[PDB]
Amino acid sequence: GSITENTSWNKEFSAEAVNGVFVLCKSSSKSCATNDLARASKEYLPASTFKIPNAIIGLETGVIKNEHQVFKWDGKPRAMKQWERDLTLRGAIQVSAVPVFQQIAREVGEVRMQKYLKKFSYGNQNISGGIDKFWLEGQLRISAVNQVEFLESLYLNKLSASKENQLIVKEALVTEAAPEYLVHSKTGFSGVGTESNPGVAWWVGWVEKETEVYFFAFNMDIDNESKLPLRKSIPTKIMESEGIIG
Amino acid sequence: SITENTSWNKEFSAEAVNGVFVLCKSSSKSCATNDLARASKEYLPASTFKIPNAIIGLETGVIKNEHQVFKWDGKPRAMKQWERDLTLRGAIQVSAVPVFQQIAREVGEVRMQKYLKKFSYGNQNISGGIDKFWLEGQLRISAVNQVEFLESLYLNKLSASKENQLIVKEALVTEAAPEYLVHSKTGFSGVGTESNPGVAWWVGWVEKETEVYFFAFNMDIDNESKLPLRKSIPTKIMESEGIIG
Ligand SMILES: *C(=O)N1C[C@H](NOS(=O)(=O)O)CC[C@H]1C(N)=O
Ligand SMILES: *C(=O)N1C[C@H](NOS(=O)(=O)O)CC[C@H]1C(N)=O
Ligand SMILES: [Co+2]
Ligand SMILES: [Co+2]
Numbered sequence: 001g002s003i004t005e006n007t008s009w010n011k012e013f014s015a016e017a018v019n020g021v022f023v024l025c026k027s028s029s030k031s032c033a034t035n036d037l038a039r040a041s042k043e044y045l046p047a048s049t050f051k052i053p054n055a056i057i058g059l060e061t062g063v064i065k066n067e068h069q070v071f072k073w074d075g076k077p078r079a080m081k082q083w084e085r086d087l088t089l090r091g092a093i094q095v096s097a098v099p100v101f102q103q104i105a106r107e108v109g110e111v112r113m114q115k116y117l118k119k120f121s122y123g124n125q126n127i128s129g130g131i132d133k134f135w136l137e138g139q140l141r142i143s144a145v146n147q148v149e150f151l152e153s154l155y156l157n158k159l160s161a162s163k164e165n166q167l168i169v170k171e172a173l174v175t176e177a178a179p180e181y182l183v184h185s186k187t188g189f190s191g192v193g194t195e196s197n198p199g200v201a202w203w204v205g206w207v208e209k210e211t212e213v214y215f216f217a218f219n220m221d222i223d224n225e226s227k228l229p230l231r232k233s234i235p236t237k238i239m240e241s242e243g244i245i246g
Numbered sequence: 247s248i249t250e251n252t253s254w255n256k257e258f259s260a261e262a263v264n265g266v267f268v269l270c271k272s273s274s275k276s277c278a279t280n281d282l283a284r285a286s287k288e289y290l291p292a293s294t295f296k297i298p299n300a301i302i303g304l305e306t307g308v309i310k311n312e313h314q315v316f317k318w319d320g321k322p323r324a325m326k327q328w329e330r331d332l333t334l335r336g337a338i339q340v341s342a343v344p345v346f347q348q349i350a351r352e353v354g355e356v357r358m359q360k361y362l363k364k365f366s367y368g369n370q371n372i373s374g375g376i377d378k379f380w381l382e383g384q385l386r387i388s389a390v391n392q393v394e395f396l397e398s399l400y401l402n403k404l405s406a407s408k409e410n411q412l413i414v415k416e417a418l419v420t421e422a423a424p425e426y427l428v429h430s431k432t433g434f435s436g437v438g439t440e441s442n443p444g445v446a447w448w449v450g451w452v453e454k455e456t457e458v459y460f461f462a463f464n465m466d467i468d469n470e471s472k473l474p475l476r477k478s479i480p481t482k483i484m485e486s487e488g489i490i491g
């Protein structure tokens with residue numbers, strides 16, 4: 001239950017000219033560290049990181065039938081070629097297939113979505129802006145601190161959802177496996193916004209490493225899609241320098 | 247049905263290996279293999295037994311839960327990598343025999359036998375010692391039966407809770423890529439003799455796109471320098487089929 005500033009991590013930000021924040025917490029000690037306490041508490045559009053709660057809610061409400069649900073490509077055109085295919089839950093999460101999750105949100109509906117975001121203490125819990133886009137271009141905002149809190153509850157199966165559904169979503173979030181560690185993670189990208197009002201990019205997740213568990217959340221301002229790989233490379237370098245991965 | 251594909255034998259002959267690969271797309275109703283007879287021949291499971299043993303441990307409550315830590319008592323263990331506290335995935339991935347020996351002891355013979363019958367797990371023969379039957383006893387399982395067992399696990403159709411099946415499934419993840427997850431487990435009984443060799447295993451499944459592939463590899467082994475072939479031969483076969491890599 002603590003947080004401390006460590007401004008030395010700022011070196012990885014300054015080298016790439018990035019304005020952003022990294023939050024890293026050790027589960028055993030309940031201790032977090034961040035480069036920027038102020039930005040750690042600033043709230044941004046979750047963008048595709050919202051697929052985590054949306055998946056849990058989808059399963060809870062029965063909108064997603066089960067773990068082996070296939071989301072069929074009806075076949076019409078879409079915004080990315082990688083979305084123009086049948087997808088599993090992991091596939092739809094991993095490729096961040098927006099129309100899949102828009103449909104899930106519509107079927108859940110506003111009253112149930114609101115209820116679950118309250119139960120999950122998910123950001124400002126403001127779902128105004130259209131049920132199928134509040135997380136991408138609406139009023140919903142969440143901080144890096146809140147993302148770590150949320151992911152810890154998921155890891156511990158302490159969200160207000162079945163253990164089974166929490167487990168389903170956890171496996172779908174596995175992005176790297178090594179003999180000494182598993183990484184569960186999710187990216188997000190709201191867009192380039194304006195040069196005055198940039199978009200946000202995220203990488204959030206946790207690392208199960210020996211007997212320790214490290215929860216993390218990264219975000220940064222972004223106004224050019226060329227910068228998007230920094231959302232993984234900055235926190236990856238940090239975690240490598242801490243000995244957690246790599 | 248099981249259908250022979252003798253073209254796969256290339257990857258075996260090249261390394262002078264006597265073994266079998268069984269690969270099934272979608273389900274175990276139809277599998278392909280290099281060797282029809284060896285596909286159904288039964289061998290000691292060795293560390294592949296950690297999969298049922300983990301499920302049974304959770305079902306019985308011996309493993310309290312998903313976040314169970316298996317504490318090291320500080321006494322010598324046969325590998326240094328085992329001389330530390332371990333999570334369930336840790337104990338599976340480093341193949342920490344003593345952790346699983348203790349699980350087995352606590353499960354006990356009666357419950358062990360009950361669950362191996364429920365799982366249709368090989369010859370279901372657990373005799374000769376509760377903490378070593380899968381290591382040096384009479385238990386035997388084929389590559390075909392490993393595929394069936396893993397398919398049941400994937401489908402949550404084993405006689406165990408969905409939760410416990412999901413726990414063990416995640417603990418088996420060994421490779422993650424954007425297009426696929428591999429769940430798998432290795433095993434190695436030992437070298438025995440040139441006349442009576444040990445057995446090496448790699449078993450698992452690949453979740454790819456909207457397809458699933460179940461697999462099981464075993465080979466005779468009498469020299470530990472050959473052990474990496476247990477992964478490389480089936481990996482090469484699956485790479486040529488476009489399933490991984
Ligand atoms: C989520 O952020 N989105 C869906 C999809 N993938 O983005 S990610 O790779 O950054 O996770 C396309 C971009 C984005 C969106 N909704 O605009
Ligand atoms: C399982 O077969 N064993 C335990 C440990 N790891 O096994 S693996 O690498 O073959 O998966 C060492 C080898 C073997 C054993 N019992 O000695
Ligand atoms: Co409901
Ligand atoms: Co995990």
Ligand SMILES: [Co+2]
Nearest residue numbers: 264265281284
């Ligand atoms: Co043979």
Ligand SMILES: [Co+2]
Nearest residue numbers: 171415427453
């Ligand atoms: Co899986």
